[PDB]
Design a protein around this nucleic acid. Sequence first.
RNA 1: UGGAGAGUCUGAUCCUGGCUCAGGGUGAACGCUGGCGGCGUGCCUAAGACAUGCAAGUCGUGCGGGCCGCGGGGUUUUACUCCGUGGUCAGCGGCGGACGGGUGAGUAACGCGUGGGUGACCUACCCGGAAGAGGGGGACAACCCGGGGAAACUCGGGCUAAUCCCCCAUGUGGACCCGCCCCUUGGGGUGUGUCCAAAGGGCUUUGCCCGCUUCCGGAUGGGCCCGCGUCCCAUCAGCUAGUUGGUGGGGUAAUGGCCCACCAAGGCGACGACGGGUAGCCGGUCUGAGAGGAUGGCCGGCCACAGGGGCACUGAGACACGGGCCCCACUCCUACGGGAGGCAGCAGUUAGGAAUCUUCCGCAAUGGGCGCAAGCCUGACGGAGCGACGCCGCUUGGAGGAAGAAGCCCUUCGGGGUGUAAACUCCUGAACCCGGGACGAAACCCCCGACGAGGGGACUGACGGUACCGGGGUAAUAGCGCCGGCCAACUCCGUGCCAGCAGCCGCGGUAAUACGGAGGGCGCGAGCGUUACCCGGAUUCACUGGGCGUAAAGGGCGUGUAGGCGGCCUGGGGCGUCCCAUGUGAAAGA
Lengths: 99, 99, 208, 83
Amino acid sequence: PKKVLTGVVVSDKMQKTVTVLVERQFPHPLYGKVIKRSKKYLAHDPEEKYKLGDVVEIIESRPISKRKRFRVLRLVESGRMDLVEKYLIRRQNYQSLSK
Amino acid sequence: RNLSALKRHRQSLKRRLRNKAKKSAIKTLSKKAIQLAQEGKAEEALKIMRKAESLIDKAAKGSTLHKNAAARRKSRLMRKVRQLLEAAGAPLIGGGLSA
Amino acid sequence: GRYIGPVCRLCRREGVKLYLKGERCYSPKCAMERRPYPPGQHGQKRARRPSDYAVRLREKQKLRRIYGISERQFRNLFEEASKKKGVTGSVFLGLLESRLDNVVYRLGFAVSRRQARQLVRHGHITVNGRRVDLPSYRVRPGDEIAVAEKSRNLELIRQNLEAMKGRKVGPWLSLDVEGMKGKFLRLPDREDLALPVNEQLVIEFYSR
Amino acid sequence: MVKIRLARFGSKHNPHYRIVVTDARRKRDGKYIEKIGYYDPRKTTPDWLKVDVERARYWLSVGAQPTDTARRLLRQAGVFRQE
RNA sequence: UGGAGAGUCUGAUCCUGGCUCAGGGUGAACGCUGGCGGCGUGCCUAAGACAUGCAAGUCGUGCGGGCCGCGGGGUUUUACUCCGUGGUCAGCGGCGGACGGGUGAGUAACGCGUGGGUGACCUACCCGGAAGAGGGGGACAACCCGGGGAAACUCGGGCUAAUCCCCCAUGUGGACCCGCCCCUUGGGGUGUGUCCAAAGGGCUUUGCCCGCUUCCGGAUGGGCCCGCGUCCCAUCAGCUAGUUGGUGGGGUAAUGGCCCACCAAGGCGACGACGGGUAGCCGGUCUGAGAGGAUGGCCGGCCACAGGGGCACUGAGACACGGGCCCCACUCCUACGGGAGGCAGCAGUUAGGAAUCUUCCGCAAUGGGCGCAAGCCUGACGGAGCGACGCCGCUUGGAGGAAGAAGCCCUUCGGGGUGUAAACUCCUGAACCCGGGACGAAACCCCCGACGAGGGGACUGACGGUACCGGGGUAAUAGCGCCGGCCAACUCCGUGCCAGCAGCCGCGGUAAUACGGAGGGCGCGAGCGUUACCCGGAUUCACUGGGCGUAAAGGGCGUGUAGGCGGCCUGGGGCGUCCCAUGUGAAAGA
Ligand SMILES: [Mg+2]
Ligand SMILES: [Mg+2]
Ligand SMILES: [Mg+2]
Ligand SMILES: [Mg+2]
Ligand SMILES: [Mg+2]
Ligand SMILES: [Mg+2]
Ligand SMILES: [Mg+2]
Ligand SMILES: [Mg+2]
Ligand SMILES: [Mg+2]
Ligand SMILES: [Mg+2]
Ligand SMILES: [Mg+2]
Ligand SMILES: [Mg+2]
Ligand SMILES: [Mg+2]
Ligand SMILES: [Mg+2]
Ligand SMILES: [Mg+2]
Ligand SMILES: [Mg+2]
Ligand SMILES: [Mg+2]
Ligand SMILES: [Mg+2]
Ligand SMILES: [Mg+2]
Ligand SMILES: [Mg+2]
Ligand SMILES: [Mg+2]
Ligand SMILES: [Mg+2]
Ligand SMILES: [Mg+2]
Ligand SMILES: [Mg+2]
Ligand SMILES: [Mg+2]
Ligand SMILES: [Mg+2]
Ligand SMILES: [Mg+2]
Ligand SMILES: [Mg+2]
Ligand SMILES: [Mg+2]
Ligand SMILES: [Mg+2]
Ligand SMILES: [Mg+2]
Ligand SMILES: [Mg+2]
Ligand SMILES: [Mg+2]
Ligand SMILES: [Mg+2]
Ligand SMILES: [Mg+2]
Ligand SMILES: [Mg+2]
Ligand SMILES: [Mg+2]
Ligand SMILES: [Mg+2]
Ligand SMILES: [Mg+2]
Ligand SMILES: [Mg+2]
Ligand SMILES: [Mg+2]
Ligand SMILES: [Mg+2]
Ligand SMILES: [Mg+2]
Ligand SMILES: [Mg+2]
Ligand SMILES: [Mg+2]
Ligand SMILES: [Mg+2]
Ligand SMILES: [Mg+2]
Ligand SMILES: [Mg+2]
Ligand SMILES: [Mg+2]
Ligand SMILES: [Mg+2]
Ligand SMILES: [Mg+2]
Ligand SMILES: [Mg+2]
Ligand SMILES: [Mg+2]
Ligand SMILES: [Mg+2]
Ligand SMILES: [Mg+2]
Ligand SMILES: [Mg+2]
Ligand SMILES: [Mg+2]
Ligand SMILES: [Mg+2]
Ligand SMILES: [Mg+2]
Ligand SMILES: [Mg+2]
Ligand SMILES: [Mg+2]
Ligand SMILES: [Mg+2]
Ligand SMILES: [Mg+2]
Ligand SMILES: [Mg+2]
Ligand SMILES: [Mg+2]
Ligand SMILES: [Mg+2]
Ligand SMILES: [Mg+2]
Ligand SMILES: [Mg+2]
Ligand SMILES: [Mg+2]
Ligand SMILES: [Mg+2]
Ligand SMILES: [Mg+2]
Ligand SMILES: [Mg+2]
Ligand SMILES: [Mg+2]
Ligand SMILES: [Mg+2]
Ligand SMILES: [Mg+2]
Ligand SMILES: [Mg+2]
Ligand SMILES: [Mg+2]
Ligand SMILES: [Mg+2]
Ligand SMILES: [Mg+2]
Ligand SMILES: [Mg+2]
Ligand SMILES: [Mg+2]
Ligand SMILES: [Mg+2]
Ligand SMILES: [Mg+2]
Ligand SMILES: [Mg+2]
Ligand SMILES: [Mg+2]
Ligand SMILES: [Mg+2]
Ligand SMILES: [Mg+2]
Ligand SMILES: [Mg+2]
Ligand SMILES: [Mg+2]
Ligand SMILES: [Mg+2]
Ligand SMILES: [Mg+2]
Ligand SMILES: [Mg+2]
Ligand SMILES: [Mg+2]
Ligand SMILES: [Mg+2]
Ligand SMILES: [Mg+2]
Ligand SMILES: [Mg+2]
Ligand SMILES: [Mg+2]
Ligand SMILES: [Mg+2]
Ligand SMILES: [Mg+2]
Ligand SMILES: [Mg+2]
Ligand SMILES: [Mg+2]
Ligand SMILES: [Mg+2]
Ligand SMILES: [Mg+2]
Ligand SMILES: [Mg+2]
Ligand SMILES: [Mg+2]
Ligand SMILES: [Mg+2]
Ligand SMILES: [Mg+2]
Ligand SMILES: [Mg+2]
Ligand SMILES: [Mg+2]
Ligand SMILES: [Mg+2]
Ligand SMILES: [Zn+2]
């Protein structure tokens, strides 16, 4: 099987490419509570179809570039920007905690 | 000292000159063909193209290009001479290409 | 090389008669007769209340010395019993009882354990027709332990079997006295052994 | 080229072989494709040779090449008998 | 089927708390001691340097020769010359030098593990199937001639063969452009057009064996991609310029910023980016009641490297340990111009180090390369040698023998101990002697049969005359630690805060069960102790399985970001969760 993930597009700013954020739930191997990790994939969008906030399936695919091995399967849920807002805020906290 | 596996090296430099020669013809013919496709000579360009192709497959016969590498160069060459022939097309000889 | 030296001194140090001397552990010379106290200068002194460790130590020694074995084979046999299915306590005893030297002694071929060991070592023992010179050879049930016909005419074998006439044998053993045969019928049970030894104490000596 | 040969699994002075399908280029005691038999040359047990003929015949339909000795032991177990 | 605790803070107590010990392990080393055998194992440090010898070749059934020799021819004789044959040497050519052997340096990484993708691919030799091999042409070695150099070697001229090279043809078929069909990433079919095949050799020479060409499939090995997992430092917090993406192009077997041009301004980070330290990873191994910790030697799988750094060539395959070029450092030769090297292959040397082996035998076995085969090579391998380094088996006697010798030790001077221990009696018979004496070995090959099935037959040893068997046969190494508590074993004398013991608590300043010796005893025994290191005890980093009023520990307080967590009813979904089937989980180990 080609691996297929479902996530939320958090980046529009490339050409023919969208960044998809994919959560993941698993029990901690020692302490056992369910922890939530998440990874960003650069997915190929040949038609510039999918926009920000879309919830899209992403399929293991023949390599397009460095850092691009997935293509956008289809659209699951259109435009829920609350997810994007959580990601943006979290990005934004990093401006503090330096100096 | 003095392994006669050295014989191998002596043959290496033989084949190096064989391979190196045929490739140099390929390139020098390929360019030639394209030069006439860009310059709108159709009959001459196709005449030369057939010789290029023949030289390619003949180099595939041996250990120079043995794989689909020869097919690569053919593909790219036929594409380039057809498209360059698209400027005031008139495919006179029509030998190398298909209708 | 097993323990070689004065033995009827360990008779004393354990506090129980150890028949490793064979005969004369029966005639009133065993030194367990009119000398039941342990050896040494302080033997006749009042002994102190032993530590809990001391008890399991003297019980393990009391068994080990009885079978005449190095600590090495002793512990390897024990751990073998700890792994095998069944009661570690009685499995160990069945395993010690299965030593070819011990069987030889037990079949009345030899006066003592040590004598049985030498008799095995010198190949005087048959097992299912084959010579076996290892005192450690594990006897299985159904094995015929005989005497090599080469040695059947030897006067020590005829000497011992002469006193074995009409003597009764362990319920897991049987022997033919004329043809100098013998057979290991089955493993002995706890009740099949009169060993003045508490197995639980030994098991409890190896938990540490 | 894939080959059918022996792999020594006994100990010193006690060889036991595993008739084995492996790439000719791997070690003799290295990773093989399939164990298709054993060989005891000192013949210590009643059964000192087992083959599973119909699997060997597979590996021969696809061109595994047996050793002279592998072929000796295979023939002995009747891999080639066609009557 | 599995879980033990103890000593030490106080005058005494309870608690907290660290330290220490008993257990197990080791690629070990050190001290004393040391009899035999089997199976394992043996540079952990300088990936420091290496003398010497061996470690990859093979094919005369692809081809033409040089040297040395013999025989037979054409001739009346000579000269010259033709054919056959033997030994040897390389050369041209083919297959193998990418396997196998070594190391652990680099690497924190798709490197490894694990599960997948390849519509993005390659695979010599091997297997199955389809089809074909017609004609012509050429060159470079060897050889011969000449020049340069001390050498390594090198330059020029001429002849020549081939399974070397090339042109034409033949088009089963394959490749490329374009179109159409079906599929759906570059998968399959089809049409026109263009392009592409080849080699001979051997005999039992009319037929067959070894080869050759194109294509499809198989099998095997491999490339590339992805999900997940993979040590420490946050006293490393910001990183990034091919950097992130795009269009086109180059390259490759093949995707891909892999590279290039141009365009956009992106990408990564507190879920730890970036930097630093450390390090091959795994199957496993050790420990532990387990959860866990520790580790990755030997063996198996993957990777990386071959004095350091870069690079390509040949090739199915390498960017190549025993191939090539270049830079650097080092050793050697040097006619000072210039050359040759590369044990982390097997042994061996030196250095360092607490420490790690034989410059051994063998092609008999298994395995690998070349070969129709005969056969050749194989420090892979099979064996031997050394080392108690580990494990295991085994010996230094067995039975009788005094209410109990001598010597030694203690004593209430009666005696007690060493102790059935010795002597001594009888029995057996490790060593050693003699003779016999292996399995591992049956194929390749030959013959019958068709070079098949099948039948038959013949040669084939390192270990080794070793194992083993049979006969004969001698009483024939014991050591080391410990004896204050934990901890099993006690007295005498010597010594007097001395000499010294000591894991911890502590012993010794005149009666020391602690020092030193002796007698005696305990514990193990061809070993026994010691040091180092790992786990355990340690619930002492507490998931299992701890805590914070006074013992170490509540942030000086708030507000609030991220994150964590979420009252009652119903319905959809089925992500976590639970069940079934199935593939996987290599071999070894357990
Ligand atoms: Mg966009
Ligand atoms: Mg791209
Ligand atoms: Mg920032
Ligand atoms: Mg050659
Ligand atoms: Mg040119
Ligand atoms: Mg190439
Ligand atoms: Mg048990
Ligand atoms: Mg019974
Ligand atoms: Mg325990
Ligand atoms: Mg391989
Ligand atoms: Mg049959
Ligand atoms: Mg239970
Ligand atoms: Mg106390
Ligand atoms: Mg206090
Ligand atoms: Mg005190
Ligand atoms: Mg305590
Ligand atoms: Mg324990
Ligand atoms: Mg220890
Ligand atoms: Mg010595
Ligand atoms: Mg050995
Ligand atoms: Mg090293
Ligand atoms: Mg180590
Ligand atoms: Mg030699
Ligand atoms: Mg003549
Ligand atoms: Mg003739
Ligand atoms: Mg000749
Ligand atoms: Mg010749
Ligand atoms: Mg030659
Ligand atoms: Mg090489
Ligand atoms: Mg290798
Ligand atoms: Mg390794
Ligand atoms: Mg780093
Ligand atoms: Mg990774
Ligand atoms: Mg992976
Ligand atoms: Mg994988
Ligand atoms: Mg010619
Ligand atoms: Mg010519
Ligand atoms: Mg030459
Ligand atoms: Mg010339
Ligand atoms: Mg020349
Ligand atoms: Mg050719
Ligand atoms: Mg056709
Ligand atoms: Mg066509
Ligand atoms: Mg043609
Ligand atoms: Mg020709
Ligand atoms: Mg594959
Ligand atoms: Mg591109
Ligand atoms: Mg290549
Ligand atoms: Mg650029
Ligand atoms: Mg993350
Ligand atoms: Mg390292
Ligand atoms: Mg365990
Ligand atoms: Mg525990
Ligand atoms: Mg590790
Ligand atoms: Mg690890
Ligand atoms: Mg090593
Ligand atoms: Mg390097
Ligand atoms: Mg290098
Ligand atoms: Mg090749
Ligand atoms: Mg190289
Ligand atoms: Mg390399
Ligand atoms: Mg070398
Ligand atoms: Mg000089
Ligand atoms: Mg030194
Ligand atoms: Mg060795
Ligand atoms: Mg010799
Ligand atoms: Mg061999
Ligand atoms: Mg061979
Ligand atoms: Mg062959
Ligand atoms: Mg050689
Ligand atoms: Mg070897
Ligand atoms: Mg020593
Ligand atoms: Mg005696
Ligand atoms: Mg006698
Ligand atoms: Mg044999
Ligand atoms: Mg035989
Ligand atoms: Mg015939
Ligand atoms: Mg036959
Ligand atoms: Mg042979
Ligand atoms: Mg011999
Ligand atoms: Mg004998
Ligand atoms: Mg005698
Ligand atoms: Mg004696
Ligand atoms: Mg103890
Ligand atoms: Mg005590
Ligand atoms: Mg001391
Ligand atoms: Mg005094
Ligand atoms: Mg005194
Ligand atoms: Mg005092
Ligand atoms: Mg004392
Ligand atoms: Mg002491
Ligand atoms: Mg003392
Ligand atoms: Mg003493
Ligand atoms: Mg031993
Ligand atoms: Mg030791
Ligand atoms: Mg510890
Ligand atoms: Mg713990
Ligand atoms: Mg602590
Ligand atoms: Mg601690
Ligand atoms: Mg606590
Ligand atoms: Mg206080
Ligand atoms: Mg406090
Ligand atoms: Mg407060
Ligand atoms: Mg405070
Ligand atoms: Mg709720
Ligand atoms: Mg929630
Ligand atoms: Mg519901
Ligand atoms: Mg579900
Ligand atoms: Mg399963
Ligand atoms: Mg397994
Ligand atoms: Zn007694």
